[PDB]
């Protein structure tokens with residue numbers, strides 16, 4: 001329990017600060033270990049609550065210990081910030097953000113399960129942030145109590161776990177950091193049981209046996225680990241595991257450190273009441289009062305706490321091995337800073353200079369109980385931030401030259417982020433973590449605060465990574481729409497791999513990396529983010545409605561009045577031309593003359609037809625056209641707007657099942673109008689044109705990028721699956737892996753990710769994006785053909801009649 005003054009004093013000696021977190025796979029004991037740390041060294045102040053985000057620990061080392069610290073030290077007191085990290089381990093950006101504010105990590109590994117993918121994933125991300133690791137092989141009690149494992153087996157298990165870990169480290173750690181691997185002999189590996197208050201270092205035992213073996217501890221701790229044997233028969237220390245006769249010698253670690261512990265466990269747990277007093281006496285352990293009566297685990301717990309007070313082992317590795325900002329910002333400056341390496345701000349970062357201009361990185365926005373207000377959490381890399389200070393808020397898109405994302409505003413208050421609470425403070429110099437109030441509106445997620453107009457902005461760690469699984473989300477109660485729209489924003493910000501957007505059909509879409517990911521997202525969206533009943537339903541694939549040939553016969557339709565008639569034919573527009581329209585070569589607003597010269601000279605069009613295009617559709621710019629081929633219609637000019645409008649309507653909603661048209665050309669052959677405009681009005685001609693277009697369309701023989709990375713030998717599975725799903729290979733490129741690109745119908749992609757791992761031995765990684773467009777040759781009007789099935793499914797899904805109205809339905813015989 002410290003006062004604000006004591007805390008602030010502790011925060012001045014950043015050489016004696018440790019910013020770190022605990023990395024662990026679910027159930028490996030991350031929680032019980034931190035409870036242990038908190039109960040042993042947690043710090044507390046001598047009605048606003050927050051979600052626990054970080055905890056402060058306090059530790060004192062002996063004068064000799066502090067001498068062993070291979071880094072700048074000021075005194076024997078240490079302040080340890082145990083920073084909370086998310087539990088989602090999908091290489092998410094929320095995790096990367098949390099690690100970014102730490103410098104070291106306590107990696108928890110299970111005695112039995114060893115290093116699992118989740119563990120490798122966070123560690124890999126950590127190494128990517130140049131974080132130094134230290135390991136704790138947890139749940140050791142399981143191997144002794146449940147599995148009855150033997151000493152050499154337990155040893156071997158420990159050694160294999162340590163090797164698995166140093167494989168990940170040696171693979172992803174920056175060579176510039178040197179050897180960041182972990183070594184039990186160097187004290188960077190702890191062993192124990194977070195559930196059961198005892199731990200040790202070889203050093204403590206060396207101290208204990210040095211003045212007893214008549215040898216200095218430097219010599220003793222080297223002998224208490226690895227291949228050092230003490231032959232009781234010769235009374236000598238050797239490095240050979242056998243004697244002259246070749247008989248097996250027990251390792252010094254086993255003989256002097258493990259055996260005493262093993263004997264204590266065995267004697268106490270088996271109630272050997274005549275063997276316990278002696279053993280305790282020999283180890284100089286003293287039971288006082290009610291303790292003398294304890295037995296079994298109760299006695300054990302109490303005896304081990306006295307003999308070797310877990311937290312102690314962990315704190316020792318944290319203080320002695322994890323890195324302290326002055327030291328680190330010297331080699332981290334350039335990465336952290338986008339600007340010039342010779343820049344005034346970069347230098348201020350390298351020197352962790354508190355008198356320079358401000359360089360404060362906003363790690364994330366944290367939820368507060370202050371009615372919808374989020375406080376900015378971050379770290380001062382340069383300068384010092386002050387309450388009421390005028391600063392420059394630069395979002396993710398800011399550039400020193402443009403005024404994008406820029407926001408000048410005063411910082412309302414600078415607060416210490418202590419667990420769920422805050423503590424207003426006047427200022428905070430470079431090298432410290434801190435919270436800012438009043439930045440809510442201008443920044444959401446990461447950012448960069450500066451006090452220099454020149455200041456440039458600041459920068460992120462081996463499952464699917466593409467949002468291939470998507471559903472439509474909608475409120476059950478219309479009035480809730482606002483909360484949903486807001487919830488999606490909140491959801492997107494908290495999840496890097498989550499995607500939300502509005503569909504062509506007006507539905508909010510939420511897409512996730514995999515079925516499970518999407519499920520968490522929807523649960524969180526509904527329960528928290530939006531907090532309102534949501535309705536989930538089918539991603540729907542969009543299709544286009546086109547024609548394969550010219551109308552088999554002139555289309556004829558009359559107006560409601562029955563006085564007006566339009567005669568037309570529909571024909572295919574060449575792909576190259578549709579593409580040209582879609583991509584900017586042939587444009588709706590270009591000068592009709594020059595455009596017609598291009599369409600005629602370069603695309604084979606008849607220049608008169610081209611000069612006479614009346615409009616593009618849908619939306620006035622789509623790849624469908626109306627060309628005027630009439631000769632002597634008197635009031636043509638007066639119906640043009642109605643005809644154009646009807647086309648925008650027809651091409652927007654095709655007659656097959658309501659999808660947009662594409663590559664459809666319509667030629668107006670003739671129009672017969674009533675002499676009086678009353679009759680001829682849009683309300684008469686718009687329906688006529690739309691009815692005729694649908695008819696010409698139906699009479700024209702109507703018709704309606706998956707990137708995979710993987711090893712060579714696995715590629716064969718890819719072709720195997722694709723062939724089972726109307727797939728089609730596109731490209732096979734490459735000394736990393738391979739990358740196969742192919743087209744995969746959307747209605748053949750449900751469960752694809754599963755069948756692919758199954759066919760590639762879990763070695764292939766898919767990625768999918770909507771691509772097109774390809775014309776299906778089957779009949780859209782035949783409920784049993786490939787195209788027809790798709791059309792029948794969409795029609796039922798929309799509550800339309802199953803049978804597709806045929807052309808005769810829009811044809812008005814003369």
Ligand SMILES: CO[C@H]1[C@@H](O)[C@H](O)[C@H](OC[C@@]23C[C@@H]4[C@H](C)CC[C@H]4[C@@]4(C=O)C[C@@H]2CC(C(C)C)[C@@]34C(=O)O)O[C@@H]1C
Nearest residue numbers: 467470503504509539540541542543746768769770771
């Ligand atoms: C960056 O992420 C990308 C990729 O996931 C992919 O390109 C995806 O495709 C979405 C679709 C896009 C197509 C174009 C807009 C026209 C046709 C559209 C589609 C309709 O069937 C095909 C894909 C899949 C879709 C339906 C089923 C949702 C599309 C849609 O948005 O409706 O879009 C997101 C934003």
Ligand SMILES: Nc1nc2c(ncn2[C@@H]2O[C@H](COP(=O)(O)OP(=O)(O)O)[C@@H](O)[C@H]2O)c(=O)[nH]1
Nearest residue numbers: 025026027028029030031032139142193194195
């Ligand atoms: N046997 C054993 N179980 C442990 C140990 N530490 C934690 N556990 C158990 O493992 C489960 C998960 O522990 P927890 O601390 O919540 O792990 P986390 O979710 O990874 O942080 C709980 O049932 C614990 O009681 C340990 O050292 N030994």
